Write an enzyme that holds these catalytic residues in place. Sequence first.
Site, PDB file in Angstrom:
ATOM      1  N   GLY A  27       2.289   2.515  -2.591  1.00 63.45           N
ATOM      2  CA  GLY A  27       2.405   3.128  -3.598  1.00 63.45           C
ATOM      3  C   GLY A  27       3.271   2.519  -5.147  1.00 63.45           C
ATOM      4  O   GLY A  27       3.752   3.652  -6.088  1.00 63.45           O
ATOM      5  N   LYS A  28       3.540   1.328  -4.713  1.00 60.39           N
ATOM      6  CA  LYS A  28       4.039   1.026  -5.764  1.00 60.39           C
ATOM      7  C   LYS A  28       3.216   0.996  -7.283  1.00 60.39           C
ATOM      8  O   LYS A  28       4.276   1.298  -8.434  1.00 60.39           O
ATOM      9  CB  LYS A  28       5.366  -0.329  -5.588  1.00 60.39           C
ATOM     10  N   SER A  29       2.882   0.451  -7.449  1.00 57.72           N
ATOM     11  CA  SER A  29       2.071   0.694  -8.372  1.00 57.72           C
ATOM     12  C   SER A  29       1.644   1.733  -9.282  1.00 57.72           C
ATOM     13  O   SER A  29       1.106   2.429  -9.931  1.00 57.72           O
ATOM     14  CB  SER A  29       0.444  -0.547  -8.312  1.00 57.72           C
ATOM     15  N   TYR A  30       0.849   2.468  -8.474  1.00 57.30           N
ATOM     16  CA  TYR A  30       0.482   3.989  -8.716  1.00 57.30           C
ATOM     17  C   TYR A  30       1.668   4.771  -9.009  1.00 57.30           C
ATOM     18  O   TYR A  30       1.787   4.950 -10.227  1.00 57.30           O
ATOM     19  CB  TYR A  30       0.567   4.704  -7.082  1.00 57.30           C
ATOM     20  N   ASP A  85       6.908  -4.074 -10.930  1.00 62.41           N
ATOM     21  CA  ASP A  85       6.440  -3.767  -9.791  1.00 62.41           C
ATOM     22  C   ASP A  85       6.155  -5.433  -9.052  1.00 62.41           C
ATOM     23  O   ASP A  85       5.294  -5.544  -8.816  1.00 62.41           O
ATOM     24  CB  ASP A  85       5.101  -3.319 -10.270  1.00 62.41           C
ATOM     25  N   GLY A 107       1.020  -1.038   0.205  1.00 61.26           N
ATOM     26  CA  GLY A 107      -0.023  -0.017  -0.092  1.00 61.26           C
ATOM     27  C   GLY A 107       0.972   1.640   0.222  1.00 61.26           C
ATOM     28  O   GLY A 107       0.110   2.445   0.114  1.00 61.26           O
ATOM     29  N   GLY A 138       4.096  -5.845  -1.896  1.00 61.05           N
ATOM     30  CA  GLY A 138       3.713  -4.704  -0.929  1.00 61.05           C
ATOM     31  C   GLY A 138       4.512  -5.785   0.248  1.00 61.05           C
ATOM     32  O   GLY A 138       4.466  -7.223   0.862  1.00 61.05           O
TER      33      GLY A 138
HETATM   34  N1  LIG Z   1       1.029   9.521  -5.040  1.00 56.78           N
HETATM   35  C1  LIG Z   1       0.309   9.258  -5.215  1.00 56.78           C
HETATM   36  N2  LIG Z   1      -1.040  10.216  -5.332  1.00 56.78           N
HETATM   37  C2  LIG Z   1      -2.367   9.905  -4.579  1.00 56.78           C
HETATM   38  N3  LIG Z   1      -2.288   8.279  -4.943  1.00 56.78           N
HETATM   39  C3  LIG Z   1      -1.636   7.819  -4.158  1.00 56.78           C
HETATM   40  C4  LIG Z   1       0.044   8.207  -4.381  1.00 56.78           C
HETATM   41  N4  LIG Z   1       0.848   7.032  -4.150  1.00 56.78           N
HETATM   42  C5  LIG Z   1      -0.284   5.766  -3.420  1.00 56.78           C
HETATM   43  N5  LIG Z   1      -1.352   6.271  -3.910  1.00 56.78           N
HETATM   44  C6  LIG Z   1      -2.483   5.996  -3.370  1.00 56.78           C
HETATM   45  O1  LIG Z   1      -2.122   4.570  -2.277  1.00 56.78           O
HETATM   46  C7  LIG Z   1      -2.530   3.307  -2.543  1.00 56.78           C
HETATM   47  C8  LIG Z   1      -1.690   2.458  -2.744  1.00 56.78           C
HETATM   48  O2  LIG Z   1      -1.294   2.441  -3.657  1.00 56.78           O
HETATM   49  P1  LIG Z   1      -0.639   1.072  -4.947  1.00 56.78           P
HETATM   50  O3  LIG Z   1      -1.879   0.747  -5.208  1.00 56.78           O
HETATM   51  O4  LIG Z   1       0.120   2.855  -5.043  1.00 56.78           O
HETATM   52  O5  LIG Z   1       0.282   0.752  -3.365  1.00 56.78           O
HETATM   53  P2  LIG Z   1       0.831  -0.663  -3.309  1.00 56.78           P
HETATM   54  O6  LIG Z   1       1.015  -0.353  -4.864  1.00 56.78           O
HETATM   55  O7  LIG Z   1       1.849   0.032  -2.619  1.00 56.78           O
HETATM   56  N6  LIG Z   1      -0.037  -2.060  -2.980  1.00 56.78           N
HETATM   57  P3  LIG Z   1       0.255  -3.003  -2.710  1.00 56.78           P
HETATM   58  O8  LIG Z   1       0.664  -3.773  -4.136  1.00 56.78           O
HETATM   59  O9  LIG Z   1      -1.053  -3.687  -1.986  1.00 56.78           O
HETATM   60  O10 LIG Z   1       1.450  -3.409  -1.903  1.00 56.78           O
HETATM   61  C9  LIG Z   1      -3.943   3.455  -3.678  1.00 56.78           C
HETATM   62  O11 LIG Z   1      -5.163   3.300  -3.758  1.00 56.78           O
HETATM   63  C10 LIG Z   1      -2.735   4.551  -4.513  1.00 56.78           C
HETATM   64  O12 LIG Z   1      -3.878   5.229  -5.866  1.00 56.78           O
HETATM   65 MG   LIG Z   2       0.698  -2.663  -6.512  1.00 57.95          MG
END
Ligand SMILES: Nc1ncnc2c1ncn2[C@@H]1O[C@H](COP(=O)(O)OP(=O)(O)NP(=O)(O)O)[C@@H](O)[C@H]1O
Ligand SMILES: [Mg+2]
Length: 329
Positions: free
Chosen positions: A99-102, A241, A97, A244
């Site tokens: 933000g790796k995928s974002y 990617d 969570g 977590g």
């Molecule tokens: N820079 C950013 N700005 C806005 N939202 C963000 C940002 N980074 C992460 N998020 C949000 O926070 C959450 C974590 O996103 P991602 O989905 O990025 O997580 P991981 O990929 O960190 N998760 P995981 O695969 O479960 O370990 C999502 O709901 C994203 O939309």
């Molecule tokens: Mg992810």
Amino acid sequence: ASVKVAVRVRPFNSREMSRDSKCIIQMSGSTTTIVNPKQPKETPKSFSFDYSYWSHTSPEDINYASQKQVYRDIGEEMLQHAFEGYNVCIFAYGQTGAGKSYTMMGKQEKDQQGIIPQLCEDLFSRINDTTNDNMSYSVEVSYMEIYCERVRDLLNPKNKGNLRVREHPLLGPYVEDLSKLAVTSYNDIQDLMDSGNKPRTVAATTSSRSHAVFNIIFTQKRHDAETNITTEKVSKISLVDLAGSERGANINKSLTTLGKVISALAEMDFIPYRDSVLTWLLRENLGGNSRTAMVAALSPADINYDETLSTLRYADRAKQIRNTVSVNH
Ligand SMILES: Nc1ncnc2c1ncn2[C@@H]1O[C@H](COP(=O)(O)OP(=O)(O)NP(=O)(O)O)[C@@H](O)[C@H]1O
Ligand SMILES: [Mg+2]
């Protein structure tokens, strides 16, 4: 060529706001300082990194780091090595969570595209702006998923059998029968990207336990006029990617091992690359002929202090990694 490392702090998430979390992450220049909410009076821990992305607020903030800005920095930097002929690799690491995928994929909507979409667009844009008729190009793509040491071809759902990771007697690791598709336009490779993101298995039986690897084999053909030989310049682009680090287990082998490899390389006999599919495949990106960069995602919340400090320490070790690189021509 040392491994470049970036850290990026996101905004609070629902779990954090609900706990009235305070921000224990502070960024200044290339420095990242983390506060211990458990031991407020203990001296704060600072880390030095190649890139520090402050994304805790919003784009309305002058000091905010956007998708575009993150890409235009480490993203164009790696794409340019690719163009130089080097194998390249950018992988996002960090707590579940964080933000790796974002960062890597972002949202297919307005302004929210991550490093992978943006790189593909830039790559095609540059190719299409070529004016030397002696230059021709070829882009092949592959997208896979690793979950419990099992490989799935994200570009071919129809196939329900997990692919075998092998070691080519002379050319290194590779996934057997992994689809490798040729694309002549951003849109095509984007439709293939979306298709892959939908096939990915994050269902609900919770948070991502699988790693995604987006590979682009970018080939540059230069035609010499006088004799008809065509020198090829090849460079593999691996965008990773990971799952977590989160907070017999075969669901976490790759991650645990990834940490060992990272540390043993930073210490540099012998490395457990083969202890996991993830480290076996990316062997050459880790300690081989590749220009590699890590992007460490971090929660800004106090409730995740241990996890985040953990990330910062692995991010710190990566920096110490050095790889012998040579252009492929
Ligand atoms: N820079 C950013 N700005 C806005 N939202 C963000 C940002 N980074 C992460 N998020 C949000 O926070 C959450 C974590 O996103 P991602 O989905 O990025 O997580 P991981 O990929 O960190 N998760 P995981 O695969 O479960 O370990 C999502 O709901 C994203 O939309
Ligand atoms: Mg992810």
